[PDB]
Amino acid sequence: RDEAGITGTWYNQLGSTFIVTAGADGALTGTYESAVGNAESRYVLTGRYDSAPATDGSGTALGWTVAWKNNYRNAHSATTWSGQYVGGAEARINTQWLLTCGTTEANAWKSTLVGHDTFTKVK
Amino acid sequence: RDEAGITGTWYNQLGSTFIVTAGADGALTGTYESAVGNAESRYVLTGRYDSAPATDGSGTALGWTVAWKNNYRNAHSATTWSGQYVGGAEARINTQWLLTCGTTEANAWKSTLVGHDTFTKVK
Amino acid sequence: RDEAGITGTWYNQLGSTFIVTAGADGALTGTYESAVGNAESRYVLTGRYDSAPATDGSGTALGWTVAWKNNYRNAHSATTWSGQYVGGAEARINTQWLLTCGTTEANAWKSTLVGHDTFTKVK
Amino acid sequence: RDEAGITGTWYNQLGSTFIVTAGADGALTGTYESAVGNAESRYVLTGRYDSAPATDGSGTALGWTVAWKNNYRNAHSATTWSGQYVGGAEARINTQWLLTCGTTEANAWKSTLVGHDTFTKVK
């Protein structure tokens, strides 16, 4: 249990801010603020993490979702991050993500972006 | 608002069962039961959806996460689905997903599977 | 060796046409014509396939690339398909793909689409 | 045209070596040696790149495939890298990749890994 290790404020390589609380039972709750794209201010996030990881030096699997609707903007889109927490002096969350736009059927082939974000506790 | 359209039981092409409730504010909550892999019985899911989609025939963006720990098994892994709800007589949720395993650093290159699931309200 | 099984004309769910020759040594060469996007007429493709697959009922791994430049248009982008050939009366090539646009550094986060195409020998 | 910029030896973060020649017409040809996985020595690669990129500071889209069969080993799998070349004093190729294994139909859900590699001209 990395409940303590995961809870807090994280920053990615784009300068986005991910604020999360890890629950004892596996829940992730918080807010996400993107430095890029059709986004302003904070958005609700929720997700899950493995609350009883392997003790063999493996990371801790987790994921979360943001739907890009808040009181300011609606980008008609959602991102999910899937990744792992790695603890220690340079803790990180290493993720891959999928961002789906709501599209017509004709445009569904071009609905989903993929990328990768690495989160740290500094900067 | 597809709060009503999205809430309920869905089935994918693998025979997995996704039971979800859509909240007015954008929340998704429920359970997931995989027909395949290192899984048994139900797992908690959470996610988000666009509660005010475009009215131009576009789908409704959404996503959710399952961490593959329950009272029965722990697969030290998490899947996120990112996709869109499309309503009407043959409603569907069309997704792409990322499944991350907790791994050592040496094995992190091989940590993440990607695939695609389509959910329907029958079968 | 599925040199014979793979060589020929294939069609995907979008109505795109993939014309390929499989070489004895593993090469794939041909042309691709997309039914969608910033594309017209045929584009060169090249790729590779496993020329000595497992004999246990497994599929045949393969992949190919199209850069979306031809004499007609230049979409400053490239798609790679990664997948497997499955032979028999309803032969198919089942793929996932990544389409990268050339972007500025500022826009690199939004450079890559992901999707999935299934190719058949009819329609 | 980055025919000159792209041709040569590149190294990724895993310590893999990618040796490529860029043709005037868009072709990529060469060899790949993975530092990790079920691989030994060099494998043939082929791919494509945009031979007439935008002149607005954008990168150069490209992709390539390796099928993991050579005289030494056959991993019954293929990787495709999709990405962009960015030139200048710290030139890089930034990619996302999909590695498909040949699988039975029952196991096709777990056939494809996704990841990201960054290639540089040093180390």
Side-chain angles (χ1 to χ4, degrees):
Chain A
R1 159 155 129 282
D2 302 298
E3 176 173 357
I6 292 169
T7 293
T9 302
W10 295 84
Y11 305 95
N12 73 15
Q13 77 289 345
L14 297 173
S16 304
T17 303
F18 168 47
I19 292 174
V20 64
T21 300
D25 59 346
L28 300 176
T29 61
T31 60
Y32 200 94
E33 182 169 5
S34 183
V36 298
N38 186 11
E40 116 189 47
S41 194
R42 290 171 306 280
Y43 298 82
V44 172
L45 71 90
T46 186
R48 300 290 294 164
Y49 78 103
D50 177 6
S51 58
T55 58
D56 63 4
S58 297
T60 302
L62 59 63
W64 67 95
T65 302
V66 169
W68 294 109
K69 175 181 187 298
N70 67 7
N71 290 337
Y72 303 101
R73 288 199 198 181
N74 193 347
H76 300 311
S77 48
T79 301
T80 64
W81 291 257
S82 183
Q84 62 185 312
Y85 163 87
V86 178
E90 309 213 296
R92 63 202 168 118
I93 301 173
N94 291 328
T95 73
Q96 298 188 79
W97 52 259
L98 295 169
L99 176 171
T100 309
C101 292
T103 70
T104 58
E105 297 183 58
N107 294 329
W109 70 272
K110 58 176 173 176
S111 68
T112 310
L113 289 170
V114 59
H116 45 96
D117 288 353
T118 299
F119 296 87
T120 66
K121 297 286 296 166
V122 326
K123 156 62 159 230
Chain B
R1 159 155 129 282
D2 302 298
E3 176 173 357
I6 292 169
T7 293
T9 302
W10 295 84
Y11 305 95
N12 73 15
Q13 77 289 345
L14 297 173
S16 304
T17 303
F18 168 47
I19 292 174
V20 64
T21 300
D25 59 346
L28 300 176
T29 61
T31 60
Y32 200 94
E33 182 169 5
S34 183
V36 298
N38 186 11
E40 116 189 47
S41 194
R42 290 171 306 280
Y43 298 82
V44 172
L45 71 90
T46 186
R48 300 290 294 164
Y49 78 103
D50 177 6
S51 58
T55 58
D56 63 4
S58 297
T60 302
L62 59 63
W64 67 95
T65 302
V66 169
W68 294 109
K69 175 181 187 298
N70 67 7
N71 290 337
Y72 303 101
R73 288 199 198 181
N74 193 347
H76 300 311
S77 48
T79 301
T80 64
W81 291 257
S82 183
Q84 62 185 312
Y85 163 87
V86 178
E90 309 213 296
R92 63 202 168 118
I93 301 173
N94 291 328
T95 73
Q96 298 188 79
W97 52 259
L98 295 169
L99 176 171
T100 309
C101 292
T103 70
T104 58
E105 297 183 58
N107 294 329
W109 70 272
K110 58 176 173 176
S111 68
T112 310
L113 289 170
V114 59
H116 45 96
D117 288 353
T118 299
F119 296 87
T120 66
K121 297 286 296 166
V122 326
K123 156 62 159 230
Chain C
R1 159 155 129 282
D2 302 298
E3 176 173 357
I6 292 169
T7 293
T9 302
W10 295 84
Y11 305 95
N12 73 15
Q13 77 289 345
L14 297 173
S16 304
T17 303
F18 168 47
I19 292 174
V20 64
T21 300
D25 59 346
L28 300 176
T29 61
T31 60
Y32 200 94
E33 182 169 5
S34 183
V36 298
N38 186 11
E40 116 189 47
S41 194
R42 290 171 306 280
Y43 298 82
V44 172
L45 71 90
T46 186
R48 300 290 294 164
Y49 78 103
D50 177 6
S51 58
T55 58
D56 63 4
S58 297
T60 302
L62 59 63
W64 67 95
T65 302
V66 169
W68 294 109
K69 175 181 187 298
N70 67 7
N71 290 337
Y72 303 101
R73 288 199 198 181
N74 193 347
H76 300 311
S77 48
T79 301
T80 64
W81 291 257
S82 183
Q84 62 185 312
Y85 163 87
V86 178
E90 309 213 296
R92 63 202 168 118
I93 301 173
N94 291 328
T95 73
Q96 298 188 79
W97 52 259
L98 295 169
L99 176 171
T100 309
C101 292
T103 70
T104 58
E105 297 183 58
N107 294 329
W109 70 272
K110 58 176 173 176
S111 68
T112 310
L113 289 170
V114 59
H116 45 96
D117 288 353
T118 299
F119 296 87
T120 66
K121 297 286 296 166
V122 326
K123 156 62 159 230
Chain D
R1 159 155 129 282
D2 302 298
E3 176 173 357
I6 292 169
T7 293
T9 302
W10 295 84
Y11 305 95
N12 73 15
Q13 77 289 345
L14 297 173
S16 304
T17 303
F18 168 47
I19 292 174
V20 64
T21 300
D25 59 346
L28 300 176
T29 61
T31 60
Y32 200 94
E33 182 169 5
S34 183
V36 298
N38 186 11
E40 116 189 47
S41 194
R42 290 171 306 280
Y43 298 82
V44 172
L45 71 90
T46 186
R48 300 290 294 164
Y49 78 103
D50 177 6
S51 58
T55 58
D56 63 4
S58 297
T60 302
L62 59 63
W64 67 95
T65 302
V66 169
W68 294 109
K69 175 181 187 298
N70 67 7
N71 290 337
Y72 303 101
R73 288 199 198 181
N74 193 347
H76 300 311
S77 48
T79 301
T80 64
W81 291 257
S82 183
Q84 62 185 312
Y85 163 87
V86 178
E90 309 213 296
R92 63 202 168 118
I93 301 173
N94 291 328
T95 73
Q96 298 188 79
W97 52 259
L98 295 169
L99 176 171
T100 309
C101 292
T103 70
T104 58
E105 297 183 58
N107 294 329
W109 70 272
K110 58 176 173 176
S111 68
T112 310
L113 289 170
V114 59
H116 45 96
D117 288 353
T118 299
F119 296 87
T120 66
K121 297 286 296 166
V122 326
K123 156 62 159 230

